[PDB]
Design an enzyme around this catalytic site. Structure first.
Site, PDB file in Angstrom:
ATOM      1  N   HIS A  73      82.256  38.077 -14.395  1.00  0.00           N
ATOM      2  CA  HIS A  73      80.913  38.076 -14.857  1.00  0.00           C
ATOM      3  C   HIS A  73      80.543  38.993 -15.866  1.00  0.00           C
ATOM      4  O   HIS A  73      81.184  39.875 -16.079  1.00  0.00           O
ATOM      5  CB  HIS A  73      79.868  37.829 -13.680  1.00  0.00           C
ATOM      6  CG  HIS A  73      79.511  39.033 -12.809  1.00  0.00           C
ATOM      7  ND1 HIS A  73      80.564  40.079 -12.615  1.00  0.00           N
ATOM      8  CD2 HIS A  73      78.372  39.725 -12.593  1.00  0.00           C
ATOM      9  CE1 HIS A  73      80.004  41.062 -11.947  1.00  0.00           C
ATOM     10  NE2 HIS A  73      78.619  40.831 -11.934  1.00  0.00           N
ATOM     11  N   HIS A  75      78.363  41.648 -16.178  1.00  0.00           N
ATOM     12  CA  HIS A  75      77.820  43.058 -15.706  1.00  0.00           C
ATOM     13  C   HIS A  75      79.134  44.056 -16.008  1.00  0.00           C
ATOM     14  O   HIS A  75      80.303  43.660 -15.969  1.00  0.00           O
ATOM     15  CB  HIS A  75      77.559  43.123 -14.066  1.00  0.00           C
ATOM     16  CG  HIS A  75      76.048  42.570 -13.987  1.00  0.00           C
ATOM     17  ND1 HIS A  75      75.689  42.391 -12.732  1.00  0.00           N
ATOM     18  CD2 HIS A  75      75.219  42.380 -14.725  1.00  0.00           C
ATOM     19  CE1 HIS A  75      74.629  41.727 -12.607  1.00  0.00           C
ATOM     20  NE2 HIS A  75      74.294  41.902 -13.999  1.00  0.00           N
ATOM     21  N   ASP A  77      80.451  46.321 -14.446  1.00  0.00           N
ATOM     22  CA  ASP A  77      81.533  46.720 -13.472  1.00  0.00           C
ATOM     23  C   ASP A  77      82.725  45.635 -13.694  1.00  0.00           C
ATOM     24  O   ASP A  77      83.740  45.794 -12.947  1.00  0.00           O
ATOM     25  CB  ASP A  77      81.017  46.605 -11.866  1.00  0.00           C
ATOM     26  CG  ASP A  77      80.389  45.279 -11.683  1.00  0.00           C
ATOM     27  OD1 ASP A  77      79.489  45.032 -11.951  1.00  0.00           O
ATOM     28  OD2 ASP A  77      81.088  44.403 -11.128  1.00  0.00           O
ATOM     29  N   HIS A 135      74.803  35.081  -7.972  1.00  0.00           N
ATOM     30  CA  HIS A 135      74.691  36.567  -8.103  1.00  0.00           C
ATOM     31  C   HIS A 135      74.419  36.793  -9.862  1.00  0.00           C
ATOM     32  O   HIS A 135      73.523  37.622 -10.181  1.00  0.00           O
ATOM     33  CB  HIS A 135      75.866  37.317  -8.058  1.00  0.00           C
ATOM     34  CG  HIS A 135      75.752  38.619  -8.538  1.00  0.00           C
ATOM     35  ND1 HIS A 135      74.948  39.633  -8.230  1.00  0.00           N
ATOM     36  CD2 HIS A 135      76.668  39.320  -9.345  1.00  0.00           C
ATOM     37  CE1 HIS A 135      75.394  40.680  -8.730  1.00  0.00           C
ATOM     38  NE2 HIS A 135      76.172  40.652  -9.546  1.00  0.00           N
ATOM     39  N   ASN A 163      71.657  43.520  -6.037  1.00  0.00           N
ATOM     40  CA  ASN A 163      70.820  43.525  -7.345  1.00  0.00           C
ATOM     41  C   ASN A 163      70.656  42.032  -7.753  1.00  0.00           C
ATOM     42  O   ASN A 163      71.458  41.293  -8.108  1.00  0.00           O
ATOM     43  CB  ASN A 163      71.648  44.238  -8.445  1.00  0.00           C
ATOM     44  CG  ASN A 163      70.660  44.582  -9.549  1.00  0.00           C
ATOM     45  OD1 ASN A 163      69.759  43.838  -9.821  1.00  0.00           O
ATOM     46  ND2 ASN A 163      70.902  45.654 -10.308  1.00  0.00           N
TER      47      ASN A 163
HETATM   48 ZN   LIG Z   1      76.965  41.794 -11.122  1.00  0.00          ZN
END
Ligand SMILES: [Zn+2]
Length: 221
Positions: A73, A75, A77, A135, A163
């Site tokens: 995804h 993000h 990370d 998410h 989050n």
């Molecule tokens: Zn994420």
């Protein structure tokens, strides 16, 4: 805290990198290195250029060439190493939805993109599955049919949705139901931060998703 590499199964390693959350502490982030025909595929890339370089070189110097990376995804990370990988012309992959989010966020994009419910990154070995938004709007998971191992990433949130800044709470239950019906056969499921588990993580996630719609870890009890 140093990058860690741990053996999960024959030719499947978990890489753990770490981010400091200022107001909390350090959080682990899991991705995979998958070895196919003595060649290495990254499943998610460590937050930083330095840890990505360390991971990659670690495998490459010992004779397993890096063939590509897939980010699960948008993000950081999951995508933090895309800049470094691209700078070395190592093929990077992410879905069209993920690249669109990266573009909007002023982030460097994967060099290769895909769409659809199923994408085979490596024929019969590494499959990418999109269960629908959760998410994040773009989250996908990665299935390894030979070990029956599922990398769930940020979608798998067994003990709290975390989050919600970019989550689709309306769709998350339907997505989680689809994922669960799809990969109930998994022997291991790998979440981004929570512990590696069995197929039961799929159900817990669903529960979380559902409960969430009704409206770092949190260790207070
Ligand atoms: Zn994420």
């Amino acid at each position: 805290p140093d990058l860690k590499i741990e053996k999960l199964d024959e030719g499947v390693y978990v890489h753990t990198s770490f981010e400091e959350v200022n107001g909390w502490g350090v959080v682990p982030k899991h991705g995979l290195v998958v070895l196919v025909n003595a060649e290495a595929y990254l499943i998610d890339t460590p937050f930083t250029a330095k840890d990505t370089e360390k991971l990659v070189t670690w495998f490459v110097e010992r004779g397993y060439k890096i063939k590509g990376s897939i980010s699960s995804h948008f993000h950081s990370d999951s995508t933090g190493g895309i800049e470094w990988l691209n700078s070395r012309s190592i093929p990077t992959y992410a879905s069209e939805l993920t690249n669109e989010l990266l573009k909007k966020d002023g982030k460097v994009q994967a060099t290769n993109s895909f769409s659809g419910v199923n994408y085979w990154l490596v024929k019969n070995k590494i499959e990418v599955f999109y269960p629908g938004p959760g998410h994040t709007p773009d989250n996908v998971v990665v299935w390894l049919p030979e070990r029956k191992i599922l990398f769930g990433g940020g979608f798998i949130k067994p003990y709290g949705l975390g989050n919600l800044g970019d989550a689709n709470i309306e769709a998350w239950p339907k997505s989680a139901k689809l994922l669960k019906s799809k990969y109930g056969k998994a022997k291991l499921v790998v979440p981004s931060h929570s512990e590696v588990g069995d197929a039961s993580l799929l159900k817990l996630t669903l529960e979380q998703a559902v409960k969430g719609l009704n409206e770092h870890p949190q260790f207070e009890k």
